[PDB]
Ligand binder design. Structure first.
Ligand code: HEM
Length: 397
């Protein structure tokens, strides 16, 4: 295995790596376009060129064998494969089409005012207590926990267990380590509870959930698939959105001159969030599995091989980005892989962007200055990058 390519001892699932990932991500890029990780016996690609290429060759680098370390072809799935994320065309085309229609631009346009109003109120609220708050619990998590479940049609009370439930999702794409084991145990007590809220009788009319269920009535999807697709949105959208808003606030808080540009021109809100996604990519990695013997950037990769993609690294590859390590809210961000690329490119990106834009717009208008006011605590996850705590001080406009 790994014949003809550079072998490395880098551990992409170690907490030491998660705590300070950039130096090693650079090592991965400089070693070659294709490397082999001896600690896990899997191939890896960290440059923008190859990551983009692989993501856009869904036939060759499939997702139906799992986007995690396990090969669902060779091994009986230890967890049920996602009917959307871990499906290849044409199956994927069918379930994707439903979600794509439900999370359309027209839908976002209808939700915009409500999302903005909630954002403005949240910021006024935070300022009222004083600027001294935790950007994670009080904003990165609080804001989406309000508007996202609302748009989904989930009940108002008991949202306290959505994150505990959602923590399993992306950790499950990693090996059976302590992070994985802890997320499973933390999620267990809420599994049945959250699944129940995704059944048709429990969804508020008009929300994402109810609209998805309507597709059961026509035949596009079965009554059994419907609640699973609904739950997939929650799973795929909670930690990612929290980490996304967290990254944007973290970036603007650490680089005051960029927040100054934003305040001077609030219309940069959407791009400041997009740049935050490129710079501090919520979804750092995940796998694809080869379905045939292939040639990739000079390397020979056999069929049935797991390939680990580093989206964060691709988003900071100097071969593609000028001054990659600089957070620039006016940067031309088009092309970054923070939401992936190709047939699987985040079907929920418009929702995520709406939320992010709206939060940063409220900040740009209501806050005069932002500063980190205490020790930062990073949230460790097998495939995601995020913060557990970020004390900051918001100065009123
Ligand atoms: C900052 C926010 C977000 C980021 C950075 C993000 C990133 C991603 C990435 C990188 C993928 C690709 C996985 C692959 O190719 O295997 C993905 C897929 C997906 N995401 Fe997002 N995500 C975000 C928010 C959301 C939200 C809020 C939702 C729910 C509305 C969501 C629903 C999905 C779904 C359903 C897929 C699978 C699409 C398919 O397989 O066709 N995501 N996301």
């Amino acid at each position: 295995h790994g014949a003809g390519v550079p072998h490395l001892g880098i551990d992409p699932f170690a907490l030491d790596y998660f705590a300070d990932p950039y130096p090693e991500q650079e090592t991965l890029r400089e070693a070659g376009p294709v490397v082999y990780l001896d600690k896990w016996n899997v191939y890896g690609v960290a440059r923008y060129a190859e990551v983009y290429a692989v993501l856009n060759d869904p036939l060759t680098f499939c997702s139906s064998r799992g986007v995690g370390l396990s090969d669902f072809k060779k091994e009986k799935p230890w967890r049920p494969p996602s009917l959307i994320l871990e499906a290849d065309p044409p199956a994927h085309t069918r379930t994707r089409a439903v979600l794509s229609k439900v999370l359309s631009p027209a839908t976002m346009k209808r939700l915009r005012d409500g999302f903005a109003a909630a954002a403005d109120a949240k910021i006024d609220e935070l300022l009222a207590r004083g600027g001294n708050i935790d950007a994670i619990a009080d904003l990165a998590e609080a804001y989406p926990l309000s508007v996202f479940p609302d748009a989904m049609g989930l009940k108002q009370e008991g949202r306290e267990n959505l994150l505990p439930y959602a923590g399993l999702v992306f950790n499950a794409f990693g090996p059976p380590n302590e992070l994985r084991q802890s997320a499973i145990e933390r999620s267990a007590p809420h599994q049945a509870y959250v699944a129940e809220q995704c059944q048709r009788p429990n969804l508020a009319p008009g929300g994402f959930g109810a609209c998805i269920h309507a597709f059961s009535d026509t035949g596009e999807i079965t009554p059994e698939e419907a609640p699973l697709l609904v739950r997939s949105l929650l799973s795929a959208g909670l930690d990612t959105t929290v980490n996304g808003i967290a990254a944007a606030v973290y970036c603007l808080a650490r680089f005051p001159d960029e927040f100054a540009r934003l305040r001077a021109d609030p219309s940069l809100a959407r791009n400041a969030f997009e740049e935050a996604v490129r710079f501090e990519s919520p979804v750092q990695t995940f796998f694809r599995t080869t379905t045939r013997d292939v040639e990739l950037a000079g390397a020979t990769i056999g069929e049935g091989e797991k390939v680990l993609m580093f989206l964060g690294s691709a988003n900071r590859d100097p071969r593609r980005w000028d001054d990659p390590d600089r957070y620039d809210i006016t940067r031309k961000t088009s092309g970054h892989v923070g939401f992936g690329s190709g047939v699987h490119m985040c079907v929920g990106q418009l929702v995520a962007r709406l939320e992010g834009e709206v939060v940063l717009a409220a900040l740009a208008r209501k806050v005069a200055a932002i500063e980190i006011a205490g020790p930062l605590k990073r949230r460790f996850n097998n495939t995601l990058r995020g913060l557990e705590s970020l004390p900051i001080q918001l100065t009123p406009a």
